[PDB]
């Protein structure tokens, strides 16, 4: 996260951090959608160009964390993964279309004041909140150099035509872009390290937080005038349900 502010304790209880087992290294963000299922981006797990093809046993996730450098005794929880599921139509060679993946925790995590699931959007919430100008939220650690505590940034969804002209890659309806114009009316943004993390919005109707998107591709914290893309969660909801209901 760049140009963001310090998040408050328990402000993003669904935030999940994905780590490489050995050597230990933070790889991506992710989100808790139930006591045993975690949502993230497919490129966080599978990206051939960089020789990335992780298996369940190469990773682990930490949940309920606020500080990146200090251990939070009796607060944060660690979990191994039982299975990883990548969308079969995930396109890593072109536009990262359907850049989504699910990870099943080996053992269910206990919910607490610091660990709580985010909602998956329903049709009405998606139709209602997914509008240009409306702001969503992304959280992650600083790699602004790095951070102490979790960072937060609120970004406006961008007009589809503007998103299309910001990149030469072929965008699809399964993705949307968000961010402030390069001229600076504001300027926070998600970075490479926030890949896979959730883009959430709060429904004014029922006061609940919904994960509308998944942070897609990023390199460092610079997009050279471009906008970050997000996987459209509602559009891929049936796939998520298919995977969970069967496994």
């Amino acid at each position: 996260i760049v140009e963001g502010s310090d998040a408050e304790i328990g402000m993003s209880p669904w935030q999940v951090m994905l780590f490489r087992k050995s050597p230990q290294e933070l790889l991506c963000g992710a989100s808790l959608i139930s006591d045993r299922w975690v949502l993230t981006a497919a490129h966080c797990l599978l990206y051939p160009p960089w020789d990335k093809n992780f298996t369940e046993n190469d990773l682990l996730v930490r949940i309920g964390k606020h500080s990146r450098t200090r251990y939070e005794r009796n607060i944060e929880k660690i979990s191994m993964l039982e299975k990883i599921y990548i969308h079969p139509r995930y396109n890593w060679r072109e536009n990262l279309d359907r850049n989504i993946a699910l990870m099943k925790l080996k053992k269910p995590v206990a919910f607490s004041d610091y660990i709580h699931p985010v909602c998956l959007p329903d049709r009405e919430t998606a139709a209602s909140l997914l509008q240009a100008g409306y702001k969503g939220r992304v959280t992650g650690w600083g790699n602004l150099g790095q951070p102490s505590v979790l960072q937060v940034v609120n970004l406006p969804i961008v007009e589809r035509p503007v998103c299309k002209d910001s990149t030469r890659i072929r965008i699809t309806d399964n993705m949307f872009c968000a961010g402030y114009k390069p001229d600076e009316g504001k300027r926070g943004d998600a970075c490479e390290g926030d890949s896979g993390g959730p883009f959430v919005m709060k429904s004014p109707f029922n006061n609940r937080w919904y994960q509308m998107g998944i942070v897609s591709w990023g390199e460092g914290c610079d997009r050279d005038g471009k906008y970050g893309f997000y996987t459209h969660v509602f559009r891929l909801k049936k796939w998520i349900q298919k995977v969970i209901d069967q496994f």
Binding site: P117, C119, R137
Partner: protein, 32 residues
């Protein structure tokens, strides 16, 4: 186990407390 209690934060919505910037999001949602 969220489907029912999902999206309601124990330290915020559950305690009738708002975080520092959620206002920014809610104010951005115009047309209805």
């Amino acid at each position: 186990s969220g489907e029912a209690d999902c999206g309601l934060r124990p330290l915020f919505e559950k305690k009738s407390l708002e975080d520092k910037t959620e206002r920014e999001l809610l104010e951005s949602y115009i047309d209805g």
